[PDB]
Structure formats: structure tokens, C-alpha cells
Write a protein that binds this ligand. Structure first.
Ligand SMILES: O=C(O)/C=C/c1ccc(NC(=O)C2(NC(=O)c3ccc4c(C5CCCCC5)c5n(c4c3)CC(=O)Nc3ccccc3-5)CCCC2)cc1
Ligand SMILES: NC(=O)COc1ccc2c(c1)S(=O)(=O)N=C(c1c(O)c3cc(F)ccc3n(CCC3CC3)c1=O)N2
Length: 551
């Protein structure tokens, strides 16, 4: 079947930013008939996944619990209420949500409407390879439906992926735990070989059968009968496909592939990619495979069979993925150093802590983080990518010297150190106070994140070259700026002083011997790094448990 069919009605509007103007170019790329051929490897892997899914017991979320996960600025309903009404449990919001639920239980077939829009994302104007990337397409149902999806499937999509894929499920790891997993897998092999597999437009490649196979896995859970019916109806009426409406309310077309903005997108894509890849590893005869899967992002570490043999096994893996309707974007290439593999737009690098001991950490090319940060300093944005980058990339040279210095100087100038900001981590929205960053960083990366040094030449050069290319002052300027930022933070005391002392410890000549922040243990990070919710419309406000008077 065709991934999409179009009426011709335009996908209407809401360093460069992707707009609604480039939507036509994206539509051409993602529109095609899918040819899927399944085999015994696929069937064997599915049965193994199902046996693991069978250990899961999932609970039905109440209307109140589902309402509480809704982001404050989530798209309003076309039925007379918005995200504020949902979070307040308003009479109108709650009555409509209950009617949507009742309809899911009563109607098992009518396709549910969705809205289609072009994603506005900032990329760097780099005239080195081709040109500007076309806008990605976002497909999502109405607010009432999104609350119902949480009631039925929030517990499933939060628990089932780890139960099925075990250590291969990537969203259970913080960046440091992801690094630890990759390093351990690499060291376990006699002669390691690793590769990333890029699927061309993964959402478009997902077939009706893929979605039903994904539902057959959900159905292995112990579920409340209404949750079981809701999952069955949501599968047929929403997940499998349905009509597309643009922002103007015009019939835009029809979808028969994965919608980006439903609660099951991340879980479903991860399960689908894992199933196809594990089956393709068997068809390719790759020895002792370790897979790490995050949605459509796949990395495989295995036992090398020699240079020519590895190139041949990779082409066999690709042919098998292609049959399963997961063809490649960039062709996969075997890598023989862990540091050279790019997965989840990141690579492993090594540094030393204050005692000269090796510390592996996760980094990336800083061009896109710096460009996006520049866009965000220039104009007000709902989500602050700089904040998420400081959190996830806290041990890196560039996040510490440039992002921390620049944004802390802006917060000091605006007196907004205590103002909570939104950032996206694994598709979920978190409301975080920048004053909590030293405690968050210690919890996720450890005390060593504040004293790393002896960065690799390759890492230092990538950073320095990127600054030159973007017209950013050199690293020596950032050291001078950080010394002043640090001094002003120290003067303020409390959490602000901890920001100065811990985040800017690298900027001082003498360098302090840092002790653990006592209040860090109080942070409730239980919802962090459990699952991916990309396009799932999930929100959390960072909270503190058992606070001590003197902290
Ligand atoms: O050789 C030496 O010894 C010293 C050299 C030297 C060179 C340049 C400066 N620049 C500055 O003082 C100014 N800009 C900056 O001090 C500046 C700060 C951050 C900048 C950023 C990002 C960095 C990441 C956080 C957000 C801001 C970008 N650009 C920046 C410029 C350059 C810029 O203009 N825009 C972009 C565009 C895309 C990406 C990055 C940038 C402020 C007043 C005059 C211009 C200072 C010293
Ligand atoms: N195709 C589908 O359906 C979704 O497929 C997906 C594939 C990968 C991801 C997602 C969806 S996500 O939207 O859930 N977010 C991330 C992600 C982040 O949130 C993230 C946030 C930051 F501020 C900084 C770095 C981040 N990094 C890199 C560092 C990390 C440790 C690995 C991610 O990868 N990964």
C-alpha cells in the first residue's frame, strides 16, 4: 500500500529553520508503495519477543493521571478546551475525554482524524554537501484522543520495551550508561566490529502488518479489558492509518504508515527496528551481535570475520532489512574503533578525571547544538535545546566552555536563574530550573563531569574548527568570560554558588577539590531515562523529595 495519498491541498503553516515551504519536497520523498517480504528469521524473532512481552502487567491510567502528563502548551482540542483545562481537570475537558474513551470502546473501525503540519527545526547553513534539508511532517490526533492514548498505553509504552528488548532498549540509559553499555559490548568481543544502520524515512517504511505485529506484542501484556479494547480500536482506527487534515481544516490526504505524533511512535518504532534488525543479523550470519536500538536509530556491535567478510555480511544485512521494508539511507560501513561510530548523533570519547583516571563520555559534533543555541538566544522558543544539551552533554569540552558560560551570563543579566525552563529529553518535556543543573549533572554523569581534562586532539580540533566556522570567539575568550560568570555566581550563595563552583571549576588556575552536593540525592529522577516518548506529548516538572532545612 501507499505510505501516503495526497489531495493536493497544501500542508499549511502553524543557520536556517525548516518551514512549510519545503513540505512538498518531503512529501515526494516519503510517498511510495511498500513491498514487504517476511521469512522464518523474522517469525522466530517475533515469537521470542512475544514470550518476553508475556511477562508484562500494565495498568490503565485514570483520567486524572493521564491529564497530569499533558504538557501545559500541548495543542488545544477542536472541541472547545485546551491543555490548561485538561491539567485543571475542567468539567468540559474531562467530559469530552470520557466521551472519546467510550467511543473507542464502542466503535472498532472508524478512522480517527489527524492534523498534518511541517516541523520547524533549526539546522546549520552548510554549503558543503547538497543543500537545505526539507521540513519533517508531524501527524497527530486531537487532544482528547491523546489523553485516551495515555490512559490505555502509557504504562505499556513505559514498561514493555525494556521487558522485550532487555539491555538493547536504548531509552533506559542516561548518556553515561549508554557509553558504559557500548564500551562493555565492544570489550566483550575478540575482534570487535560495529556499525550504525540508517533507514531511509523509517516512518514511511512501517507497514499495516508492522503495526498489527506491534499490537500482537502489546496484547501479550496482562491488561484491563477496556485497555485491551482501546488498544485494539486505536490500532485499527489510528495507528494503522487514517485521513490527514491541514491546519486550515482542509482534507490533505491519507496515511497508511507510522504517524509521528502518537503515544506508540517511539515504542512501536523501537520494537519494529529491533525485530527487523535481529532477524537481518541472522540472515547476514553476523556472529555474537549486540544491538542498541532507539526508535529508528540502530547500532550493532559484533565479532569481526575479516575486512572483506564484514563488508559482505553488511550487504547481506542490508538486503534482509530491505526485504522487511527498512531500506538504507546512507549505506552501512564497518567500524573498528568504538570512538568512530556515530549513533543517536553521538560518539564515545575518553578524558581524564582529577586523579588522572580514564573516563569515557558521550560527545557529538557541536555545529547543530551551537546553531540552535544561537537561534534560541536571538528569539524566544518554547523548548530550549541548549538546556537539554547542557544536561546530556555536561562532560564535553564545548558544553562546559561555551554553552554553560554563554547561558549562565544571559541568566545573570536577566536575573532568571530560578525561572523553570522546558527541555526535551527522550521525547518527554521536562520543566527544569537552571539552578538545579549541578545536582542533575552529578546524578547523571558523576562528580568527575566537573573536573574532566586531557580531552582528545580530535575532540579539541572538532570544537576549535566549529567555533572558527561559526564566528564564535576562541576557547581562551570563553575561559575569561567563565571566570567572571563564576565570580558573580559565588557571591550569590546557595544553589547559584554551587553553579559557579561546580560548573566553572575548569576555568580556575588552582582548581578546587570538589565534594558531592548533599541535596543532589533529593532529586526525583525516577521518570528520567526509562522510555522514549518522541511525539507522545509527555510532560514532567522536576521535583525534590525529603528536603533538609539547611540545604
Ligand atoms: O582572538 C582573540 O583573542 C579574540 C577573539 C574574539 C572574537 C570574537 C569575539 N566576539 C564577540 O565579542 C561578540 N560575539 C560573541 O561573543 C559571540 C558569542 C556567542 C556566539 C554564538 C553562539 C555560541 C553558542 C551559544 C549561543 C551563541 C555564535 N556566535 C557568537 C558570538 C557568532 C554569531 O554571530 N552567531 C552564531 C551563529 C551560529 C552559531 C553560533 C553563533 C560579542 C560582541 C562582538 C561580537 C570576541 C573575541
Ligand atoms: N524514529 C522515532 O520514532 C524516534 O526515534 C528517536 C531516535 C533517537 C532519539 C529519539 C527518537 S528522542 O526524540 O527520544 N531523543 C533522543 C535524544 C535526545 O532526547 C537528546 C536530547 C538532548 F538534549 C541531547 C541529546 C539527545 N540525544 C543524544 C544523546 C543520547 C544519549 C543518546 C538523543 O539521542 N534520541
Amino acid at each position: 500500500s501507499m505510505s501516503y495519498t495526497w489531495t493536493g491541498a497544501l500542508i499549511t503553516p502553524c543557520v536556517y529553520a525548516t518551514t512549510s515551504r519545503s513540505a512538498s519536497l518531503r512529501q515526494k520523498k516519503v510517498t511510495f508503495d511498500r513491498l514487504q517480504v517476511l521469512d522464518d528469521h523474522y517469525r522466530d524473532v517475533l515469537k521470542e519477543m512475544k514470550a518476553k512481552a508475556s511477562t508484562v502487567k500494565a495498568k490503565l491510567l485514570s483520567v486524572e493521571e493521564a491529564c497530569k502528563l499533558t504538557p501545559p502548551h500541548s495543542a488545544r482540542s477542536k472541541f472547545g478546551y485546551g491543555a490548561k483545562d485538561v491539567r485543571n481537570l475542567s468539567s468540559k475537558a474531562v467530559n469530552h475525554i470520557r466521551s472519546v474513551w467510550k467511543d473507542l470502546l464502542e466503535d472498532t473501525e472508524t478512522p480517527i482524524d489527524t492534523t498534518i503540519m511541517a516541523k520547524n527545526e533549526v539546522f546549520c547553513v552548510q554549503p558543503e554537501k547538497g543543500g537545505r534539508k526539507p521540513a519533517r511532517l508531524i501527524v497527530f490526533p486531537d487532544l482528547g484522543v491523546r489523553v485516551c492514548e495515555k490512559m490505555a498505553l502509557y504504562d505499556v509504552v513505559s514498561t514493555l520495551p525494556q521487558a522485550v528488548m532487555g539491555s538493547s532498549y536504548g531509552f533506559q540509559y542516561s548518556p553515561g550508561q549508554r557509553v558504559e553499555f557500548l564500551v562493555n559490548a565492544w570489550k566483550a568481543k575478540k575482534c570487535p566490529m560495529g556499525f550504525a544502520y540508517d533507514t531511509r524515512c523509517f516512518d514511511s517504511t512501517v507497514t499495516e502488518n508492522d503495526i498489527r505485529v506491534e499490537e500482537s506484542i502489546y496484547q501479550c501484556c496482562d491488561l484491563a479489558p477496556e485497555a485491551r479494547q482501546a488498544i485494539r480500536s486505536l490500532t485499527e482506527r489510528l495507528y494503522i492509518g487514517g485521513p490527514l487534515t491541514n491546519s486550515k481544516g482542509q482534507n490533505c490526504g491519507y496515511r497508511r504508515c507510522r504517524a509521528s505524533g502518537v503515544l506508540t511512535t517511539s515504542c512501536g518504532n523501537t520494537l519494529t527496528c529491533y525485530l527487523k534488525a535481529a532477524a537481518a543479523c541472522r540472515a547476514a550470519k553476523l556472529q555474537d551481535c549486540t544491538m542498541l536500538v532507539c526508535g529508528d536509530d540502530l547500532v550493532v556491535i559484533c565479532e569481526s570475520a575479516g575486512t572483506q567478510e564484514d563488508e559482505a555480511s553488511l550487504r547481506a544485512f542490508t538486503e534482509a532489512m530491505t526485504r522487511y521494508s527498512a531500506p538504507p539511507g546512507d549505506p552501512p560501513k564497518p567500524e573498528y574503533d568504538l570512538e568512530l561510530i556515530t549513533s543517536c548523533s553521538s560518539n564515545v570519547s575518553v578524558a581524564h578525571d582529577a586523579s588522572g583516571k580514564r573516563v569515557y563520555y558521550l560527545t557529538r559534533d557541536p555545529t547543530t547544538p551551537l546553531a540552535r543555541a544561537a537561534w534560541e538566544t536571538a528569539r524566544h522558543t518554547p523548548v530550549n535545546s541548549w538546556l537539554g544539551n547542557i544536561i546530556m552533554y555536561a562532560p564535553t569540552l564545548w558544553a562546559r566552555m561555551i554553552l554553560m558560560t554563554h547561558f549562565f551570563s544571559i541568566l545573570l543579566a536577566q536575573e532568571q536563574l530560578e525561572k523553570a525552563l522546558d527541555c526535551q529529553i527522550y521525547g518527554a518535556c521536562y520543566s527544569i530550573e537552571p539552578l538545579d543543573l549541578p545536582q542533575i549533572i552529578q546524578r547523571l554523569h558523576g562528580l568527575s563531569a566537573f573536573s574532566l581534562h586531557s580531552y582528545s586532539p580530535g575532540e579539541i580540533n572538532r570544537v576549535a574548527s566549529c567555533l572558527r566556522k561559526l564566528g564564535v570567539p576562541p576557547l581562551r575568550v570563553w575561559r575569561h568570560r567563565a571566570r567572571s560568570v563564576r565570580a558573580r555566581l559565588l557571591s550569590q550563595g546557595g544553589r547559584a554558588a554551587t553553579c559557579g563552583k561546580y560548573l566553572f571549576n575548569w576555568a580556575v588556575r588552582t582548581k578546587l577539590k570538589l565534594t558531592p552536593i548533599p541535596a543532589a540525592s533529593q532529586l526525583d529522577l525516577s521518570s528520567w531515562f526509562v522510555a522514549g516518548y518522541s511525539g507522545g506529548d509527555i510532560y514532567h516538572s522536576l521535583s525534590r523529595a525529603r528536603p533538609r532545612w539547611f540545604m
